[PDB]
Coordinates of C-alpha atoms and ligand atoms in Angstrom, one line a residue:
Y1 CA 6.9 74.8 11.5
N2 CA 3.7 74.5 13.6
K3 CA 1.9 72.0 11.4
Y4 CA 1.6 68.4 12.6
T5 CA 0.7 65.0 11.2
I6 CA -1.6 63.0 13.5
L7 CA -2.3 59.4 12.7
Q8 CA -5.3 58.0 14.5
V9 CA -5.9 54.2 14.8
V10 CA -9.5 53.1 15.2
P11 CA -10.4 49.5 16.2
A12 CA -13.5 47.3 15.4
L13 CA -14.9 47.9 18.9
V14 CA -16.2 51.4 18.8
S15 CA -18.3 51.7 22.0
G16 CA -18.2 55.2 23.5
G17 CA -18.4 57.5 20.5
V18 CA -14.9 56.4 19.3
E19 CA -15.6 56.9 15.6
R20 CA -17.4 60.3 16.2
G21 CA -14.4 61.6 18.2
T22 CA -11.9 60.4 15.5
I23 CA -13.8 62.1 12.7
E24 CA -14.4 65.4 14.5
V25 CA -10.7 65.6 15.5
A26 CA -9.6 64.8 11.9
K27 CA -11.9 67.5 10.5
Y28 CA -10.6 70.0 13.1
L29 CA -7.0 69.2 12.3
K30 CA -7.8 69.8 8.6
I31 CA -9.2 73.3 9.1
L32 CA -6.1 74.3 11.1
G33 CA -3.8 73.1 8.3
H34 CA -2.6 70.0 10.1
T35 CA -2.6 66.6 8.4
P36 CA -4.9 63.9 9.8
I37 CA -4.5 60.3 8.8
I38 CA -6.8 57.5 10.0
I39 CA -5.9 53.8 10.0
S40 CA -9.1 51.7 10.3
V41 CA -10.4 48.2 9.6
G42 CA -12.7 49.8 7.0
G43 CA -16.4 49.4 7.2
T44 CA -19.0 52.1 7.3
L45 CA -16.5 54.6 8.7
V46 CA -14.7 55.0 5.4
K47 CA -17.9 56.5 3.9
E48 CA -17.7 59.6 6.1
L49 CA -13.9 59.8 5.8
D50 CA -14.3 60.0 2.0
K51 CA -17.0 62.6 2.4
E52 CA -14.7 64.8 4.5
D53 CA -11.7 64.0 2.3
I54 CA -9.5 62.6 5.1
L55 CA -6.7 60.2 4.1
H56 CA -7.7 56.7 5.3
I57 CA -5.6 53.5 5.3
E58 CA -7.4 50.2 5.6
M59 CA -5.6 47.6 7.7
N60 CA -6.7 44.4 9.5
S61 CA -6.0 44.2 13.2
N62 CA -5.4 40.8 14.8
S63 CA -4.1 41.0 18.4
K64 CA -4.0 37.2 18.6
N65 CA -1.0 36.5 16.3
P66 CA 2.5 37.8 17.1
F67 CA 3.6 37.6 13.4
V68 CA 0.6 39.8 12.5
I69 CA 1.3 42.2 15.4
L70 CA 5.0 42.6 14.3
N71 CA 4.0 42.9 10.6
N72 CA 1.3 45.5 11.2
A73 CA 3.9 47.3 13.4
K74 CA 6.2 47.4 10.4
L75 CA 3.4 48.7 8.1
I76 CA 2.5 51.5 10.5
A77 CA 6.2 52.4 11.0
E78 CA 6.6 52.7 7.2
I79 CA 3.4 54.9 7.1
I80 CA 5.0 56.9 9.9
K81 CA 8.3 57.4 8.0
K82 CA 6.3 58.1 4.8
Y83 CA 4.2 61.0 6.1
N84 CA 6.6 62.1 8.9
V85 CA 3.9 61.4 11.5
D86 CA 4.5 63.3 14.7
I87 CA 2.0 61.4 17.0
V88 CA 0.2 58.1 16.7
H89 CA -3.1 58.3 18.6
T90 CA -4.7 55.0 19.6
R91 CA -8.3 54.6 20.8
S92 CA -8.1 50.8 21.2
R93 CA -9.6 48.7 24.0
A94 CA -6.6 46.5 24.8
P95 CA -3.0 48.0 24.5
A96 CA -2.4 48.9 20.9
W97 CA 0.4 46.4 20.4
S98 CA 1.2 47.1 16.8
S99 CA 1.0 50.9 17.1
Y100 CA 3.2 51.0 20.3
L101 CA 5.9 49.0 18.5
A102 CA 5.7 51.4 15.5
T103 CA 6.4 54.4 17.7
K104 CA 9.1 52.7 19.8
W105 CA 11.0 52.3 16.6
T106 CA 10.4 55.7 15.0
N107 CA 10.4 59.3 16.2
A108 CA 6.6 59.3 16.5
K109 CA 4.9 59.8 19.9
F110 CA 2.3 57.5 21.5
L111 CA -1.0 58.8 22.8
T112 CA -3.8 56.6 24.2
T113 CA -7.4 57.7 24.9
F114 CA -9.6 55.4 27.0
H115 CA -13.2 55.7 25.8
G116 CA -14.5 53.3 28.4
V117 CA -13.7 51.0 31.4
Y118 CA -12.0 47.9 30.3
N119 CA -9.7 45.6 32.4
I120 CA -6.1 44.6 31.9
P121 CA -4.5 41.6 33.6
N122 CA -3.2 42.5 37.1
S123 CA 0.2 41.0 36.3
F124 CA 0.5 43.5 33.4
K125 CA -0.4 46.7 35.2
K126 CA 3.2 47.2 36.6
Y127 CA 4.8 46.8 33.2
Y128 CA 2.2 48.9 31.4
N129 CA 2.5 52.0 33.6
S130 CA 6.2 51.7 34.4
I131 CA 7.8 50.7 31.0
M132 CA 5.2 51.2 28.2
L133 CA 3.8 54.5 29.5
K134 CA 7.2 56.0 30.6
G135 CA 7.3 59.6 29.4
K136 CA 3.8 59.3 27.8
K137 CA 0.4 60.7 28.5
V138 CA -3.1 59.1 28.4
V139 CA -6.5 60.6 27.9
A140 CA -9.7 59.7 29.8
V141 CA -13.0 60.7 28.3
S142 CA -14.4 61.3 31.8
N143 CA -13.4 61.5 35.5
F144 CA -15.1 58.1 35.9
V145 CA -12.7 56.6 33.5
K146 CA -9.8 58.5 35.1
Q147 CA -10.7 57.0 38.4
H148 CA -10.5 53.5 36.8
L149 CA -7.1 54.3 35.4
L150 CA -5.9 55.4 38.8
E151 CA -7.5 52.7 41.1
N152 CA -7.4 49.7 38.7
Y153 CA -4.6 50.3 36.2
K154 CA -2.5 52.0 38.9
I155 CA -1.4 54.5 36.3
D156 CA 0.4 57.6 37.6
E157 CA -1.9 60.6 37.9
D158 CA 0.4 63.1 36.2
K159 CA 0.1 60.9 33.1
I160 CA -3.7 61.1 32.9
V161 CA -5.4 64.1 31.1
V162 CA -9.2 64.3 31.2
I163 CA -10.8 65.5 28.0
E164 CA -14.6 65.4 28.6
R165 CA -16.9 64.6 25.7
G166 CA -18.3 67.5 23.8
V167 CA -21.7 68.2 22.0
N168 CA -21.9 70.1 18.8
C169 CA -23.7 73.2 20.1
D170 CA -24.1 74.5 16.5
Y171 CA -26.0 71.4 15.5
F172 CA -27.8 70.8 18.8
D173 CA -29.2 74.4 18.9
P174 CA -32.8 75.1 19.7
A175 CA -32.6 78.2 17.6
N176 CA -32.5 75.9 14.5
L177 CA -35.9 74.3 15.2
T178 CA -38.7 75.5 12.9
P179 CA -42.4 75.2 13.7
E180 CA -42.7 73.2 10.5
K181 CA -40.0 70.6 11.0
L182 CA -41.4 70.1 14.5
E183 CA -44.9 69.4 13.2
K184 CA -43.5 66.9 10.6
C185 CA -41.8 65.0 13.5
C186 CA -44.9 65.0 15.7
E187 CA -46.7 63.6 12.6
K188 CA -44.0 60.9 12.0
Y189 CA -44.0 59.7 15.6
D190 CA -47.8 59.8 16.3
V191 CA -47.2 62.4 19.0
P192 CA -50.4 63.7 20.8
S193 CA -51.0 67.4 21.2
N194 CA -51.5 68.6 24.7
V195 CA -49.3 66.2 26.8
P196 CA -45.7 66.1 28.0
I197 CA -43.3 64.1 25.8
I198 CA -40.7 61.8 27.4
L199 CA -37.8 60.9 25.1
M200 CA -35.5 58.0 26.0
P201 CA -32.8 58.0 23.2
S202 CA -31.1 54.8 24.2
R203 CA -30.0 51.8 22.2
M204 CA -32.4 48.9 22.9
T205 CA -30.2 46.8 25.2
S206 CA -30.9 45.4 28.6
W207 CA -28.5 47.5 30.7
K208 CA -30.0 50.8 29.3
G209 CA -32.9 50.6 31.7
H210 CA -35.9 50.5 29.4
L211 CA -37.6 48.0 31.8
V212 CA -37.1 50.3 34.8
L213 CA -38.6 53.2 32.9
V214 CA -41.7 51.1 31.9
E215 CA -42.3 50.0 35.4
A216 CA -41.8 53.7 36.5
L217 CA -44.2 55.0 33.9
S218 CA -46.8 52.4 35.0
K219 CA -46.7 54.0 38.5
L220 CA -47.8 57.2 36.7
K221 CA -50.6 55.7 34.6
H222 CA -52.9 58.5 36.0
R223 CA -50.8 61.3 34.4
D224 CA -51.3 62.0 30.8
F225 CA -48.0 61.8 28.8
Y226 CA -46.3 60.2 25.8
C227 CA -43.0 58.4 25.9
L228 CA -40.8 57.8 22.9
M229 CA -38.1 55.1 22.9
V230 CA -35.8 55.8 19.9
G231 CA -32.7 53.8 19.3
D232 CA -31.3 50.7 17.5
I233 CA -33.5 47.7 17.9
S234 CA -31.4 45.3 15.9
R235 CA -28.3 44.3 17.8
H236 CA -30.4 42.9 20.7
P237 CA -33.8 42.3 19.0
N238 CA -34.8 39.6 21.6
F239 CA -34.8 42.3 24.2
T240 CA -36.9 44.6 22.1
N241 CA -39.8 42.2 21.9
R242 CA -39.5 41.7 25.6
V243 CA -39.9 45.4 26.4
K244 CA -42.8 45.9 23.9
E245 CA -44.5 43.0 25.7
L246 CA -44.1 44.5 29.1
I247 CA -45.6 47.8 27.7
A248 CA -48.4 45.7 26.4
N249 CA -49.2 43.6 29.5
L250 CA -49.2 46.9 31.5
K251 CA -51.7 48.4 29.0
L252 CA -49.3 51.2 28.2
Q253 CA -49.2 50.7 24.4
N254 CA -50.7 54.2 23.9
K255 CA -48.3 56.0 26.2
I256 CA -45.0 54.3 25.2
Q257 CA -44.0 53.4 21.7
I258 CA -40.7 52.0 20.4
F259 CA -39.1 53.3 17.2
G260 CA -36.0 52.5 15.2
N261 CA -33.0 54.8 15.2
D262 CA -33.8 58.5 14.5
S263 CA -32.2 60.0 11.4
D264 CA -32.6 63.6 12.8
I265 CA -32.5 63.4 16.5
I266 CA -32.6 67.2 16.9
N267 CA -36.3 67.5 16.0
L268 CA -37.0 64.6 18.4
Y269 CA -35.3 66.5 21.3
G270 CA -37.2 69.7 20.3
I271 CA -40.6 68.0 20.6
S272 CA -39.7 66.5 24.0
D273 CA -39.9 68.1 27.4
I274 CA -38.0 65.4 29.5
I275 CA -35.0 63.3 28.5
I276 CA -34.2 60.0 30.2
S277 CA -31.0 58.1 30.7
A278 CA -31.9 55.1 32.9
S279 CA -28.8 52.9 32.5
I280 CA -28.4 50.4 35.4
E281 CA -24.7 49.6 34.4
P282 CA -22.2 52.5 34.3
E283 CA -21.4 54.4 31.2
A284 CA -18.1 56.2 30.5
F285 CA -20.2 59.3 29.6
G286 CA -23.9 60.0 29.0
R287 CA -24.0 61.3 25.5
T288 CA -27.7 61.8 25.5
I289 CA -27.5 63.7 28.8
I290 CA -25.2 66.3 27.3
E291 CA -27.3 66.3 24.1
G292 CA -30.4 66.9 26.1
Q293 CA -28.9 69.7 28.1
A294 CA -27.8 71.4 24.9
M295 CA -31.4 71.4 23.8
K296 CA -32.7 73.2 26.9
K297 CA -34.6 70.2 28.3
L298 CA -35.3 68.8 31.7
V299 CA -32.8 65.9 32.0
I300 CA -33.1 62.9 34.3
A301 CA -30.1 60.5 34.5
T302 CA -29.1 57.6 36.7
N303 CA -26.3 58.4 39.1
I304 CA -23.9 55.9 37.8
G305 CA -20.7 56.0 35.7
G306 CA -20.0 59.2 33.9
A307 CA -23.6 59.7 33.0
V308 CA -24.2 62.2 35.9
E309 CA -20.8 63.9 35.4
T310 CA -22.4 66.7 33.4
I311 CA -25.4 67.3 35.8
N312 CA -25.3 69.7 38.7
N313 CA -28.2 68.1 40.6
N314 CA -31.4 70.2 40.8
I315 CA -29.7 73.0 38.8
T316 CA -28.9 71.7 35.3
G317 CA -30.7 68.4 35.6
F318 CA -31.6 65.6 38.0
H319 CA -29.9 62.5 39.4
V320 CA -31.8 59.3 40.3
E321 CA -30.6 56.0 41.8
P322 CA -30.1 53.3 39.2
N323 CA -32.5 50.4 39.0
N324 CA -35.1 52.1 41.2
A325 CA -38.5 52.5 39.6
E326 CA -40.2 54.5 42.4
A327 CA -37.3 57.0 42.5
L328 CA -37.5 57.4 38.8
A329 CA -41.3 57.7 38.8
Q330 CA -41.3 60.4 41.4
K331 CA -38.7 62.4 39.6
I332 CA -40.7 62.2 36.4
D333 CA -43.7 63.3 38.4
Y334 CA -41.8 66.2 39.8
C335 CA -40.8 67.4 36.3
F336 CA -44.4 67.3 35.2
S337 CA -45.3 69.6 38.1
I338 CA -42.6 72.2 37.2
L339 CA -42.9 72.0 33.3
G340 CA -44.0 75.5 32.2
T341 CA -42.9 77.3 35.4
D342 CA -40.1 79.8 35.7
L343 CA -38.0 77.2 37.6
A344 CA -38.1 74.8 34.6
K345 CA -37.1 77.7 32.4
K346 CA -34.2 78.5 34.8
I347 CA -32.9 74.9 34.8
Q348 CA -33.4 74.6 31.0
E349 CA -31.5 77.8 30.4
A350 CA -28.8 76.7 32.9
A351 CA -28.5 73.3 31.1
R352 CA -27.5 74.7 27.7
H353 CA -25.3 77.3 29.4
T354 CA -23.2 74.6 31.2
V355 CA -22.8 72.7 27.9
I356 CA -21.6 75.8 26.1
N357 CA -19.2 76.7 29.0
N358 CA -17.8 73.2 29.7
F359 CA -19.0 70.4 27.4
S360 CA -19.0 71.8 23.9
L361 CA -17.4 69.9 21.0
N362 CA -15.4 73.0 20.4
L363 CA -13.6 72.7 23.8
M364 CA -13.1 69.0 23.3
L365 CA -11.3 69.6 20.0
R366 CA -9.1 72.3 21.5
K367 CA -8.2 70.2 24.5
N368 CA -7.0 67.5 22.0
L369 CA -4.8 70.0 20.1
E370 CA -3.3 71.2 23.4
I371 CA -2.2 67.7 24.5
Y372 CA -0.7 67.2 21.0
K373 CA 1.4 70.3 21.6
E374 CA 2.4 69.2 25.1
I375 CA 3.4 65.8 23.7
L376 CA 5.4 67.6 20.9
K377 CA 7.0 70.2 23.1
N378 CA 10.8 70.3 22.8
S379 CA 11.2 69.1 19.2
Ligands
CL401 CL1 -11.3 62.8 21.8
CL402 CL1 -17.9 63.6 29.9
CL403 CL1 -19.8 73.2 19.8
CL404 CL1 -23.1 44.5 23.4

């Protein structure tokens, strides 16, 4: 008929919103009457999969042992035969050895999505693109990743399909903010009343740029403001104490405060006026940029990686040079001077418009189903 079985394989390394993409695609396939299956190593992911009632198969990946690769490939192949899987969809960092073997032996098709920029040995690039990816397609989550696949992997262009990352415009919707839930968030985060709020929703790791923003906000010690740094502070705790100290030694403890991860990030966007991505090493895509644009905010992102891909400079947001405190401090100062004006409103409106028109989760999900149909054409 027109109903498909899509088996997604998720690895232990999940940088780049890999688990979020896998769950949203599974849920979408369910609604359309398709059958999603997810093979994972287990962990916290299974909890959501059970909530959404999606068939999950635990399995232990080990790319270091050929016997395990061959035996996992057999297990997957038997899963394929069991559920008449039409496509195996891998989102692994290295080549998905076991999954590739499973599809080579069965009628299933092989789809790869690259959620980031990783390197493969130069000796392997010829074999990968010529033999392994013959008659196959690959998905890049950004044009920044697609460029890597072209210049580094030397993968043929007509193999690469870009499916930009999407933001749930139904969840990230300023029309859902209530004046009460906002006040509760200002009360939870010690937010002052009549000052601009700067939100940096970044994991507390070194390459995110926290240090650059703190040196930038020090250059604006004369302006009144309040900066919130919300994100995990556990994976790199050594770095967190380092930042909190720099804020202290610069006597900025009352204008910048660090908080653990935010349960409901939507109310934190709603209370903010300026969102910051200050990464000094490139990112495949700037999730918080798109999320901030969806919330009708003034967005400032470093011009590096895919983080500026969603920003039409001076129209839906602003670019800054990475690792440049003065350039960042001046852009933040500029936004202060236009907050409240018709221009800010224009940019803020334009920002959510461009996310609805080009970077919605809805369009991401549909682009995934299209590439499934292309892969399954002539069957
Ligand atoms: Cl995806
Ligand atoms: Cl993107
Ligand atoms: Cl959406
Ligand atoms: Cl890391």
